[PDB]
Amino acid sequence: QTDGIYAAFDTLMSTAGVDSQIAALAASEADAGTLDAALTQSLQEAQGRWGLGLHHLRHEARLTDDGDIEILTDGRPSARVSEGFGALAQAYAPMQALDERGLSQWAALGEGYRAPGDLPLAQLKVLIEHARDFETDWSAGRGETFQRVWRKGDTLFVEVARPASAEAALSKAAWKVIASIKDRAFQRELMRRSEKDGMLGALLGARHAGAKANLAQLPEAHFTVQAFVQTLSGAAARNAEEYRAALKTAAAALEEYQGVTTRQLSEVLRHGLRES
Amino acid sequence: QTDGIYAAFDTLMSTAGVDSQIAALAASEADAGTLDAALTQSLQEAQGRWGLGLHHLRHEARLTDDGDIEILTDGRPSARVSEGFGALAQAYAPMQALDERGLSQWAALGEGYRAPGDLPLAQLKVLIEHARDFETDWSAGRGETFQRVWRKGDTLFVEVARPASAEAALSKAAWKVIASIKDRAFQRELMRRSEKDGMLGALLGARHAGAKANLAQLPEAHFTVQAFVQTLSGAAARNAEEYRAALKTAAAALEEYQGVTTRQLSEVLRHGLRES
């Protein structure tokens, strides 16, 4: 009932393109402090990619005596992996504050002044070079993306985000997955239930028993890639050239990981087609 | 440049499920008054099914000396078939007044009082049985449909409508049509351009030259089935039992013709797949 938990964590992490390899690390008999550090590292990466908007909280995950993995924010028990992925998404929901574009409204640094996102590159240079902590608001970035930047202590953070809901991603991963099926009326009656209802709807109505009870386990229904944070440290975190390069890097990686998680999703969705 | 015009009219009419057979009627050497009557009859039927909301206008179509077909409303030249189907949709646009649900705001009878759509069936019975002209506002009808009823002179009209845009219909007819293709990256990159843009978009970007110049000819991009008017005449038009049956009939036919036009669309869309 709490077994297959390392693998459950690994699958959650995969929806963010994080090959956390936690199961393998436990099979190698790694010490529990090691597993704890690895769980936390992966979760913080995933948090960099999920786009939920919670950089102002501390994200940890840790083993419990009863074989569970406990996820926490600012140290408060938020959820347990055994309670399922929908339960985790529900745990995060009240701590979010998304605007109309889906972008987070919270300041990464917390309460305080936020410089504009459109700032002239010379002004931003002065902030990078000579300020202590600082933070810009969202600005448009390229190809329907948005970007921002902030420095906490010794580390500069460059975030690039293109919000995209998880439901839609699932339905398009089911577009490819159905697309690979017999040209037949299962299709035409999914597609004619596309001019009437969402695609989990038409695919839970046109399928057989356990389509919903099976799919209610997928983490990809609650989590998907929407941003990418590239970090810099030390002298680089006060160098404007490094920041410009890091922005290029974060946009590139956004493209990459969106593609990669799409591929892994359609693959395992197609693994469910062979099983059927 | 104005040849293939009877067939152009026939194809327009097909988007509403009207097998007008105008081309065949001309090939039989029917007199031009006959062709004129048939063009008008078909167009008025199509107008009953397209859902544009223009029952308060008189719809005629007539042959011109130069081999064209002229479409008119209240006798004003509105458009010519040779100008294309997008031109006709543009001709109709300023005469519409759609609400948020897509349903027409114009009263079928024109300026005047409109009884509520939820009226108690006994009150509606008294209107059917003893009023002269009368008209109800839209009301919900069943399965996401809407319905209304009005009497002009000797004829009672029962309209049942489930608005559904033409763009969406085209994209779902292209879902089935692609669905029938090689499980390959043409798909995965249409479906990953589904989390970014409309489907005419992803299918005009992933295809080759003339996808847009060819598709810009389809009438189904501007017209689709959205309603069905069932009529009654004579004594039946003042009989409440006949009205209740006619409502059942109009909803059934709505289902039918939505299905049938979907089938004809995917068929000719799939005929374009074999041609490619």
UniProtKB/Swiss-Prot annotation, chains A, B:
Key words of the record: DNA damage, DNA repair, DNA-binding, Phosphoprotein, Stress response
Residue positions where Phosphoserine is found in the record: S104
Domain of life: Bacteria
Membrane-spanning ranges: none
Stated regulation of activity: Phosphorylation increases DNA binding affinity.
Modification after translation, per record: Phosphorylated by RqkA in vitro. Phosphorylated primarily at Thr-64, and to a little extent at Ser-104 and Thr-136.
Protein's name in the database: DNA repair protein PprA
Organism: Deinococcus radiodurans (strain ATCC 13939 / DSM 20539 / JCM 16871 / CCUG 27074 / LMG 4051 / NBRC 15346 / NCIMB 9279 / VKM B-1422 / R1)
Source taxonomy: Bacteria, Thermotogati, Deinococcota, Deinococci, Deinococcales
